[PDB]
Design a protein around this ligand. Structure first.
Ligand SMILES: *CCC(=O)N1CN(C(=O)CC*)CN(C(=O)CC*)C1
Lengths: 17, 193
């Protein structure tokens, strides 16, 4: 559902906040 | 007793947009791994000789480390252009140190893809040498401002590599270590044995 970097991966890498 | 060994042997490596820097100072340098240059796929020294580093003394030594594709290692050199040199990790023209890389497909690739390694796909301009950018600001791809909202023409700036073990060697993950030997106007703290 997320382009470029999947949402779960964005959370895992600390990219959501 | 400099921790050069731990830079190479670190279990985790950084994504290239968030390249890790380790400052080395006030220690005795063990340059043994640099003598084993035949074991690395890339080993290019600019203004340095591993067999002469024992005789030299430095104020600081920075060890930058990250994962990129093998076909991108050529960009970790002076005077290069491309997605990595431009938006992720830039070496200067006057660079002095070594660029060391090795294939890490066995560790960093996963079946289905390892999406945990990223690179910056979008940026308003190129990086200056040694500039680091870890912002996740939404990228304005159209003429209309995004106001930080991700969507139509407003893109997440970073991209997953999705490393797979069956991809060709040029698309496989390589771990890179860049050593910058700095001798500034200060007392030398990194000396040989
Ligand atoms: C693709 C964008 C998206 O679905 N969401 C925005 N967002 C993040 O980007 C977190 C880094 C919050 N969302 C989620 O956490 C669910 C995937 C929603």
């Amino acid at each position: 559902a997320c382009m470029f970097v999947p949402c779960a991966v964005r959370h895992a890498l600390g990219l959501c906040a | 007793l400099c921790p050069f060994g731990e830079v190479f042997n670190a279990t985790r490596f950084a994504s290239v947009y968030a390249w890790n820097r380790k400052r080395i100072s006030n220690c005795v340098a063990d340059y043994s791994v640099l003598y084993n240059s035949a074991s690395f796929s890339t080993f290019k020294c600019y203004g340095v000789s591993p067999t002469k580093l024992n005789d030299l003394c430095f104020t600081n030594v920075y060890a930058d480390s990250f994962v990129i594709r093998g076909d991108e290692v050529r960009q970790i050199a002076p005077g290069q252009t491309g997605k990595i040199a431009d938006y992720n990790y830039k070496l200067p023209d006057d660079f002095t140190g070594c660029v060391i890389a090795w294939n890490s497909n066995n560790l960093d690739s996963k079946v289905g893809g390892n999406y945990n390694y990223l690179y910056r796909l979008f940026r308003k301009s190129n990086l200056k040498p040694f500039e680091r950018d870890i912002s996740t600001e939404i990228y304005q791809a159209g003429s209309t401002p995004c106001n930080g909202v991700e969507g139509f023409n407003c893109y997440f700036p970073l991209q997953s590599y999705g490393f797979q073990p069956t991809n060709g060697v040029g698309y496989q993950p390589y771990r890179v270590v860049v050593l910058s030997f700095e001798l500034l106007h200060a007392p030398a703290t990194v000396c040989g044995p």
